[PDB]
Amino acid sequence: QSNAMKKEIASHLLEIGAVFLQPNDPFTWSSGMKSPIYCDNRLTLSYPKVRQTIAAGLEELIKEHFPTVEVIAGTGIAHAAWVSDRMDLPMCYVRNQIEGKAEKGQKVVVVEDLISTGGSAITCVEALREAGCEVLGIVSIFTYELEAGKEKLEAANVASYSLSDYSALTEVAAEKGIIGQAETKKLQEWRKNPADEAWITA
Amino acid sequence: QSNAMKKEIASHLLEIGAVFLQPNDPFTWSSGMKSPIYCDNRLTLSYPKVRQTIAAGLEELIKEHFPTVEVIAGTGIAHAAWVSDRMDLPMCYVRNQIEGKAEKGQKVVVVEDLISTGGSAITCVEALREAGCEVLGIVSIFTYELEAGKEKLEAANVASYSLSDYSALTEVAAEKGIIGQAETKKLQEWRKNPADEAWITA
Ligand SMILES: [Cl-]
Ligand SMILES: [Cl-]
Ligand SMILES: [Cl-]
Ligand SMILES: [Cl-]
Ligand SMILES: [Cl-]
Ligand SMILES: [Cl-]
Ligand SMILES: [Cl-]
Numbered sequence: 001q002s003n004a005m006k007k008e009i010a011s012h013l014l015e016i017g018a019v020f021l022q023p024n025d026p027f028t029w030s031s032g033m034k035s036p037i038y039c040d041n042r043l044t045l046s047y048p049k050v051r052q053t054i055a056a057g058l059e060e061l062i063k064e065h066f067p068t069v070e071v072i073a074g075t076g077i078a079h080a081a082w083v084s085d086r087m088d089l090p091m092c093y094v095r096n097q098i099e100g101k102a103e104k105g106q107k108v109v110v111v112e113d114l115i116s117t118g119g120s121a122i123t124c125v126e127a128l129r130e131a132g133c134e135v136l137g138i139v140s141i142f143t144y145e146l147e148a149g150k151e152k153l154e155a156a157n158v159a160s161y162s163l164s165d166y167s168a169l170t171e172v173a174a175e176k177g178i179i180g181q182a183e184t185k186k187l188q189e190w191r192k193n194p195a196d197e198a199w200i201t202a
Numbered sequence: 203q204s205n206a207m208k209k210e211i212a213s214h215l216l217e218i219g220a221v222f223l224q225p226n227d228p229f230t231w232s233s234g235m236k237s238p239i240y241c242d243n244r245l246t247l248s249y250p251k252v253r254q255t256i257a258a259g260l261e262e263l264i265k266e267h268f269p270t271v272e273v274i275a276g277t278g279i280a281h282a283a284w285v286s287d288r289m290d291l292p293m294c295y296v297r298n299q300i301e302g303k304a305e306k307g308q309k310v311v312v313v314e315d316l317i318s319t320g321g322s323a324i325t326c327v328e329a330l331r332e333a334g335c336e337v338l339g340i341v342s343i344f345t346y347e348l349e350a351g352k353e354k355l356e357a358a359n360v361a362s363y364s365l366s367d368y369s370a371l372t373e374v375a376a377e378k379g380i381i382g383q384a385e386t387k388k389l390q391e392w393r394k395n396p397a398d399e400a401w402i403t404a
């Protein structure tokens with residue numbers, strides 16, 4: 001659990017190619033923003049054991065932090081499916097139409113693949129709150145730990161926990177020799193100011 | 203299994219509101235076509251036991267008919283998730299981009315919520331064939347048994363099996379007293395010629 005789980009999960013994500021790092025040759029995201037990292041947890045679908053380890057971890061986060069949960073909401077659908085089955089709970093998903101039942105007062109936990117800028121997380125929470133549900137919080141597989149997302153969730157009073165995060169993944173990548181100390185500095189600078197291209201030459 | 207399973211599943215679908223019948227007051231589908239029936243299996247997501255009974259049934263259809271399966275493809279994502287977990291198989295899904303691994307020669311089974319006109323089923327099969335996969339066939343929760351769909355799948359050489367179908371559901375609905383003999387005739391005529399509004403006054 002905690003730090004051990006974060007490093008173990010980061011190791012798996014790197015190993016299966018669900019998270020890529022290229023600090024010396026930046027990726028360009030669909031927004032046009034340069035980044036040393038990209039996460040695509042859709043790839044976990046192809047790994048039956050790794051995806052189960054992830055679903056078990058998400059379930060453990062829910063039991064630990066949101067034990068009164070009544071409904072699981074995905075945005076993500078596959079992992080919400082795996083979590084809701086392990087917990088024998090109704091599921092719904094949010095496109096902002098909600099598919100599946102989400103009734104007034106029901107206690108909901110959101111399952112997200114990734115917390116990035118916070119926009120997509122807030123969009124999902126807002127849909128559920130609009131429907132009358134009590135959103136307990138969010139559990140996600142990964143988070144880039146960006147200040148923008150942190151502030152958005154804090155301001156909306158949404159508790160959020162992730163199985164692994166950028167910090168753990170940077171450390172594991174260095175332990176593995178994928179990156180070194182020079183790239184670690186670039187990774188640290190990107191997280192602090194992701195839209196500022198100074199990180200590229202940090 | 204077989205007829206028993208089809209009637210049991212139809213009963214559950216009616217009971218949870220996943221299939222509606224209104225032969226005396228036709229629905230208008232998004233295409234503008236009048237219909238005595240509508241199926242929305244997204245509602246099964248809210249029913250932990252019923253959805254498990256469905257996933258177990260889909261798994262049984264795959265074991266019975268497509269035993270050499272290597273990958274489960276959803277289009278549907280939640281049920282493909284439940285089936286792939288029970289079978290410990292990699293999963294992918296098809297939007298026609300394929301998310302998750304679908305490699306050359308891998309034996310794939312498609313999991314569909316509903317077989318209607320055949321268009322959406324063919325679209326999914328074609329994407330997987332284009333990717334180089336061997337599509338073993340399709341398993342679905344429900345089928346309207348329309349001739350249009352039957353012919354499209356036959357012409358593309360795609361084997362298709364459904365847990366329940368229109369015929370079983372009509373029979374169960376009559377047994378339950380939801381519909382009678384007069385409405386049964388209207389239902390029979392719609393299936394034969396769904397775009398011809400003579401069924402409305404059959
Ligand atoms: Cl992701
Ligand atoms: Cl695996
Ligand atoms: Cl495997
Ligand atoms: Cl709680
Ligand atoms: Cl949808
Ligand atoms: Cl986000
Ligand atoms: Cl709330």
Ligand SMILES: [Cl-]
Pocket residue numbers: 241242243244315316
């Ligand atoms: Cl459906």
Ligand SMILES: [Cl-]
Pocket residue numbers: 248249250251252253
């Ligand atoms: Cl249920």
Ligand SMILES: [Cl-]
Pocket residue numbers: 088089090250
């Ligand atoms: Cl329940």
Ligand SMILES: [Cl-]
Pocket residue numbers: 267268269270271338
């Ligand atoms: Cl086979």
Ligand SMILES: [Cl-]
Pocket residue numbers: 301
């Ligand atoms: Cl997608």
Ligand SMILES: [Cl-]
Pocket residue numbers: 316317318319320321322323324351
């Ligand atoms: Cl179809």
Ligand SMILES: [Cl-]
Pocket residue numbers: 331335336337338
């Ligand atoms: Cl094929």
